[PDB]
Design a protein around this ligand. Structure first.
Ligand SMILES: [Cl-]
Ligand SMILES: [Cl-]
Ligand code: NA
Ligand code: NA
Ligand code: NA
Ligand code: NA
Ligand code: NA
Ligand SMILES: [Ti+4]
Length: 129
């Protein structure tokens, strides 16, 4: 599913991500924009053989199981395929664990490089939320 911008912001709010660990909804929408362009089916293979899955491009080295990442963990306790669903529940639940892990949203390199410090409220501007 490719979400619309306001559509995703609404779904993220519905699942409790808005201001989670102090990161406003616009942070989360911005991160999703640059990680997946709002496409739940986005996948990206990394040089280390791990893969990133879903709207927030959650990586298989720590967070989900894909059966093909040697030495990895599955801290969210889910198949990485669950991260590709049209229903963002699994992605949101796993993102909450990832953002709680110590470096906040810096866990998402793209958030650091493209969202951090910017006018992230632009990402929710105009939306009925
Ligand atoms: Cl495995
Ligand atoms: Cl393996
Ligand atoms: Na957009
Ligand atoms: Na915001
Ligand atoms: Na894994
Ligand atoms: Na959803
Ligand atoms: Na980047
Ligand atoms: Ti594996």
């Amino acid at each position: 599913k490719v979400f619309g911008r306001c559509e995703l912001a609404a779904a993220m709010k519905r699942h409790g991500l808005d201001n989670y660990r102090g990161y406003s909804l616009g942070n989360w929408v911005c991160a999703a924009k640059f990680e997946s362009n709002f496409n739940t089916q986005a996948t990206n293979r990394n040089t280390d053989g791990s893969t990133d899955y879903g709207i927030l491009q959650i990586n298989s080295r720590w967070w989900c199981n894909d059966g093909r990442t040697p030495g990895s963990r599955n801290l969210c306790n889910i198949p990485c395929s669950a991260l590709l669903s049209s229903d963002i529940t699994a992605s949101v639940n796993c993102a909450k664990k990832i953002v709680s892990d110590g470096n906040g949203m810096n866990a998402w390199v793209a958030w650091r490089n493209r969202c951090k410090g910017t006018d992230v409220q632009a990402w929710i501007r105009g939306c009925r939320l």
